[PDB]
């Protein structure tokens, strides 16, 4: 009952206590590192044309 | 390969061989008049080789069984006229037949084979054949045996066999 | 003797079969 | 050999008998109650 | 299943003749049927059992026949007494 | 505190194995030889415990005689008499050991009526597990001989009549686990080859007399050692007959699925590998061990980066597994954007790790499926789009080969669109209203069948507790007599 004997092994052994409740992985991936200044994203787009 | 006698391979294939053989025999026995589609005689060869192996081991009872299992009566017959203590094994064979058989046709075949061997012993024993003759019926035969005993003037045993007859036979018989 | 044992077992099987059928029929009829 | 084959038949047949008895006990209970 | 009792008694009791060449068998089948609700079947079971093994001292037959002797319905007591005495 | 070691462990072993054997001997073979399942679970429990459980237990254990019933009683008595001896004197076996004590002990100590399965179990548990575990790969050379003696007992299992006479118990377990441990030894510090020949032979002798767990453990072990090297590895599965269903420990099904999943993935068969290996993963227990869960997750991620998907932005943060999946997240973070620069910067950085993982070659071909994933997401975005933009926004300079990559993507079913070669637009067809078709009826019928199957199995199996321990009752016997007398008195009046 739950023997789990395993030739396969454990393998291996933080500064990340910022748990934002859940996920955001897709969310943080969406704006990975660019398109940052959304204020500027609008502003320097209304003067463009 | 046949003689290697020492491998799982041959053991399994001979098992299925004798199985298929006895299947086909019991299937094609029981009178398929005109059909009678025969066995491939190679099966008969390789099975009778096993019969012989059983005889060599002096191991008769397996043969006496498998013979009637495959309905082959001749190998049965020979395996009574054998180095065994024949008059002792014979009663075992009869007592087997009396309680594990259903096909009356085949049962009578067997009984008709066995009857005459009791008539072939160094001293024949008449009582066994007498009762055999009222497990399948031949009143003329028992009357003839009776008159034989009269001509040989063995009257005492005639009386004893008559008593043995009255207690068991049908009134009509 | 192995043969007698074989035969005994063989028949035993059939007897079991018929008993199982009968008790199945009984279980169905007692509801009615 | 017949010792091995002829015993193999017995040992192969012997399981079914046990299983059948197993079932039959339960069904007999179910009817008795 | 049949719908008239004397058919049921004679149907049960007949089994005492088919098996009499192997006395060991009858208690293995009738021992359950002897607990039927309607007494006709119980009477038939007593007679089947008594007639399968008439001559012997067979033990399990008597083992089953003993508790019938107090069955409330008088005629099955008559049946059990006869059967007990034939065996 | 030195007393406590002998005082407690001896007490625990004097009941964890004494009762185990006492129950197995009488309920597995005394009773119809099918209900050693409780003994099986007992053996599982004892295996797990003994792994975490000794010199004095072995001398006592070994001193069981089982010559006769009175001899077995004397053996249980000697179990405590030797406890008193240890309390007063010393232990003949020292820090386990008893290296040559066992071999002589097999012949001796009035083993007149010891049952074959019990003897095998005791031999396997003491010698093999204790020696190998305490060994730390030391006894391994000696363990080889001890397991060879176990193989002699297994020569008895092959043909002492145990092959069939006690086959029920002998192969119900003990043998099944024995094969596993004996194989492990060899893997531990040895070769594997004549082991595989022996395994082939032992599988062959099964599948004829028996068809359960002799076709599960052997299949897994054999495929294991094939995969330890890198042979053909497929021509065996096709005729294997599959791990026998109808019975399994549901555990072995897991690793069998994992093996067939891998051998399917390496042979350029992607789409149906993910479903079977996910089915593999969902069958693992809730236990803390993350031994092969990490492995199967890692493989699942890497096969799903093929095709044109995203692995799932979960199963990357869960506490049990995170350090180990770090490079794989750092990889997919690159692949999603689809910038070969960073992908190279990851590979040249962690290539040592990946090739150590034994999965480097799968990810060495990944760039092409990179471009495939890009075009797939584009296909899902729009419906009618000119080729004068597909290559423009995929950094592909030529619009001639964009035709070819799109066409291939259509061929293998990545996207459903067609192409108007003259016009220059690509449009995708839309097929809806799957409710009106016949397929939902099929999907539902399968589940109906399964549920009815469950009901039959449940009412069919463990509803045996209607037992003869208490049979049937009755009523009183004087009651009716009294009542009838009273009613006849009333009648007279």
Report how many domains make up chain A.
1
Tokens 């008159």 belong to B147
Question: Does residue A28 form part of some domain?
Answer: yes
Resolution, in Å, please?
3.8
CA distance F216 to F173: 12
Specify the long-range contacts of residues F2-11, CB closer than 8 Å, at least 24 apart.
F6/F56, F6/F83, F6/F86, F6/F87, F9/F53, F9/F54, F9/F57, F10/F56, F10/F57, F10/F60, F10/F83, F10/F86
Question: Does residue A49 form part of some domain?
Answer: no
Phi, psi of A21 (to 5 degrees): 75, -75
Neighbours of chain D (3+ CB pairs under 8 A): B, C, E, F
Nearest in space to E75 (alpha carbons), one of E39, E41, E49: E39
CA distance F442 to F420: 37
Chain D residues whose beta carbon lies within 8 Å of the beta carbon of residue C17: 20
CA angle F286, F289, F292 (to 5 degrees): 100
Question: Does residue A2 form part of some domain?
Answer: no
CB contact D9 to E (< 8 Å): no
Interface of D with B (CB under 8 A): 1-2, 4-6, 8
Question: Does residue A47 form part of some domain?
Answer: no
Residue F322: both structure tokens together:
């995170």
CB spacing of B61 vs C4 below 8 angstroms: no
Whether B6 and B35 have beta carbons less than 8 Å apart is answered as no
Indicate which of C1, C8, C12 best probes the interface with B, i.e. most B CBs within 10 Å of its own CB.
Answer: C1
Neighbours of chain C (3+ CB pairs under 8 A): B, D, E
Q: DSSP 3-state assignment of F164?
A: coil
Nearest beta carbon to residue A12 from set F51, F317, F323: F323
Question: Does residue A11 form part of some domain?
Answer: yes
Phi, psi of B36 (to 5 degrees): 50, 30
Enumerate residues 6+ apart whose C-beta is below 8 A from F9: F53, F54, F57
Kindly tell me the burial class for residue F135, based on how many C-beta atoms sit within 10 Å of its own C-beta (0-12, 13-18, 19 or more).
Answer: middle
Kindly tell me the burial class for residue F281, based on how many C-beta atoms sit within 10 Å of its own C-beta (0-12, 13-18, 19 or more).
Answer: middle
Distance to chain F for B47, nearest Cα, Å:
22
Give the domain extent around A21: 7-42
Enumerate residues 6+ apart whose C-beta is below 8 A from F162: F116, F156, F170
Whether F33 and D11 have beta carbons less than 8 Å apart is answered as no
CA distance F179 to F184: 9
CB spacing of A23 vs F286 below 8 angstroms: no
DSSP conformation class of F426? E
Helix axes B60-69, B86-97, angle to 10 degrees: 30
CA distance F427 to B102: 80
Residue F427, beta-bridge partner list: F384, F418
Enumerate residues 6+ apart whose C-beta is below 8 A from B113: B73, B76, B77
Enumerate residues 6+ apart whose C-beta is below 8 A from F427: F383, F384, F417, F418, F420
Q: How many C-beta neighbours within 10 Å does residue A11 have? A: 14
CB spacing of D6 vs B62 below 8 angstroms: yes
Q: Which residue does chain E place closest to D33, by CA atoms? A: E35
Q: How many C-beta neighbours within 10 Å does residue F31 have? A: 10
Nearest in space to F133 (alpha carbons), one of F48, F51, F17, F62: F51
Question: Does residue A15 form part of some domain?
Answer: yes
CB spacing of D27 vs C23 below 8 angstroms: yes
CB spacing of B12 vs F208 below 8 angstroms: yes
Distance to chain B for F231, nearest Cα, Å:
28
Nearest in space to F173 (alpha carbons), one of F18, F287, F28: F28
Chain F residues whose beta carbon lies within 8 Å of the beta carbon of residue B12: 208
CA angle E19, E22, E28 (to 5 degrees): 75
Measured in Å, how far apart are chain A's first and last C-alpha atoms? 71
């Amino acid at each position: 009952m739950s023997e789990k004997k395993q030739p396969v092994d454990l393998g291996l052994l933080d500064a990340h206590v910022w748990e934002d409740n859940w996920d955001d992985d897709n969310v943080e991936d969406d704006f990975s590192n660019q398109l940052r200044a959304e204020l500027e994203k609008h502003g320097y787009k209304m003067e463009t044309s | 390969f046949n003689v290697n006698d020492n491998s799982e391979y041959v053991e399994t294939i001979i098992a299925k061989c004798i199985d298929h053989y006895t299947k086909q025999c019991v299937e094609n026995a029981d009178l398929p008049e005109g059909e009678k589609k025969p066995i491939d005689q190679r099966l008969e060869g390789i099975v009778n080789k096993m019969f012989q192996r059983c005889l060599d081991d002096h191991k008769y009872k397996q043969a006496i069984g498998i013979a009637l299992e495959t309905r082959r009566l001749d190998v049965f017959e020979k395996t009574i006229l054998e180095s065994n203590d024949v008059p002792g094994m014979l009663a075992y064979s009869l007592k087997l037949c009396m309680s594990l058989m259903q096909n009356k046709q085949f049962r009578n075949k067997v009984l008709r084979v066995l009857v005459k061997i009791y008539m072939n012993l160094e001293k024949p024993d008449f009582i066994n054949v007498c009762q055999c003759l009222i497990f399948l019926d031949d009143p003329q035969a028992v009357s003839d045996i009776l008159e034989k005993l009269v001509k040989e003037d063995n009257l005492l045993m005639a009386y004893q066999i008559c008593f043995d007859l009255y207690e068991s036979a049908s009134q009509q018989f | 003797d192995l043969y007698s044992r074989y035969k005994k077992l063989q028949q035993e099987l059939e007897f079991l079969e018929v008993q199982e059928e009968y008790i199945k029929d009984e279980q169905k009829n007692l509801k009615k | 050999g017949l010792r091995q084959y002829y015993l193999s038949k017995i040992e192969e047949l012997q399981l079914i008998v046990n299983d059948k008895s197993q079932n039959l006990r339960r069904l007999q209970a179910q009817r008795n109650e | 299943s049949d719908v008239n009792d004397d058919v049921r008694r004679a149907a049960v009791e007949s089994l005492g003749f088919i098996l009499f060449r192997t006395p060991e068998q009858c208690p293995s089948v009738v021992s359950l049927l002897s607990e039927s609700y309607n007494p006709h079947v119980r009477y038939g079971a007593a007679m089947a059992l008594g007639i399968c093994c008439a001559g012997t001292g067979n033990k399990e037959a008597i083992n089953l026949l003993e508790p019938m002797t107090n069955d409330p319905v008088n005629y099955v007591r008559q049946g059990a007494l006869i059967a007990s005495a034939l065996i | 505190q030195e007393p406590p070691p002998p005082p407690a462990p001896q007490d625990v072993e004097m009941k964890e194995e004494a009762a185990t054997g006492g129950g197995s001997t009488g309920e597995a073979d005394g009773k119809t030889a099918a209900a050693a399942a409780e003994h099986s679970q007992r053996e599982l429990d004892t295996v797990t415990l003994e792994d975490i459980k000794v010199s004095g237990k072995e001398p006592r254990f070994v001193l069981r005689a089982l010559r006769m019933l009175p001899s077995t009683s004397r053996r249980l008595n000697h179990y405590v008499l030797y406890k008193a001896v240890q309390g007063f004197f010393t232990s003949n076996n020292a820090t386990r050991d008893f290296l040559l004590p066992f071999l002589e002990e097999p012949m001796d100590t009035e083993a007149d009526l010891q049952f074959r399965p019990r003897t095998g179990k005791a031999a396997s548990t003491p010698l093999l597990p204790e020696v190998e575990a305490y060994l730390q790969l030391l006894v391994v050379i000696f363990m080889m001989n001890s397991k060879r003696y176990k193989e002699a007992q297994k020569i008895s299992d092959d043909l002492m009549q145990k092959i069939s006479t006690q086959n029920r118990r002998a192969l119900d377990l003990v043998a099944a686990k024995c094969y596993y441990y004996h194989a492990r030894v060899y893997e531990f510090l040895d070769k594997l080859d004549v082991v595989r020949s022996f395994l082939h032979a032992r599988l062959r002798t099964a599948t004829l007399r028996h068809d359960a767990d002799g076709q599960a453990t052997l299949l897994n072990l054999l495929l294991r050692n094939y995969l330890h090297y890198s042979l053909y590895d497929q021509a065996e599965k096709l005729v294997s007959k599959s791990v026998f269903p109808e019975q399994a420990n549901n555990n072995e099904w897991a690793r069998y699925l994992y093996y067939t999943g891998r051998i399917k993935a390496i042979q350029l068969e992607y789409s149906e590998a993910r479903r079977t290996m996910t089915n593999a993963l969902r069958k693992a227990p809730q236990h803390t061990a993350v031994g092969f869960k990490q492995t199967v997750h890692k493989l699942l991620i890497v096969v799903e980066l093929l095709l044109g998907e995203i692995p799932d932005r979960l199963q990357f943060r869960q506490p049990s597994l995170k350090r180990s999946l770090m490079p794989y997240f750092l990889l997919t973070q690159a692949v999603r954007t689809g910038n070969l620069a960073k992908f190279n910067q990851v590979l040249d950085q962690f290539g040592e790790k990946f090739q150590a993982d034994g999965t480097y070659t799968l990810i060495i071909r990944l760039r092409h499926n990179v471009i495939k994933t890009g075009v797939r997401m584009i296909s899902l975005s729009y419906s009618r789009i000119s080729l004068a933009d597909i290559a423009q926004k995929l950094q592909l300079d030529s619009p001639e080969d964009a035709e070819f990559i799109v066409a291939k993507a259509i061929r293998d079913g990545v996207i459903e669109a067609s192409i108007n070669h003259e016009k220059g637009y690509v449009q995708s067809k839309e097929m809806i209203d799957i409710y009106s078709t016949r397929e939902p009826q099929l999907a539902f019928h399968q589940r109906i069948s399964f549920c009815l199957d469950i009901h039959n199995m449940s009412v069919k199996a463990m509803r045996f507790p209607p037992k003869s321990y208490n049979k049937d009752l009755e009523s009183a016997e004087e009651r009716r007599e009294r009542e009838q007398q009273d009613l006849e008195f009333a009648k007279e009046m």
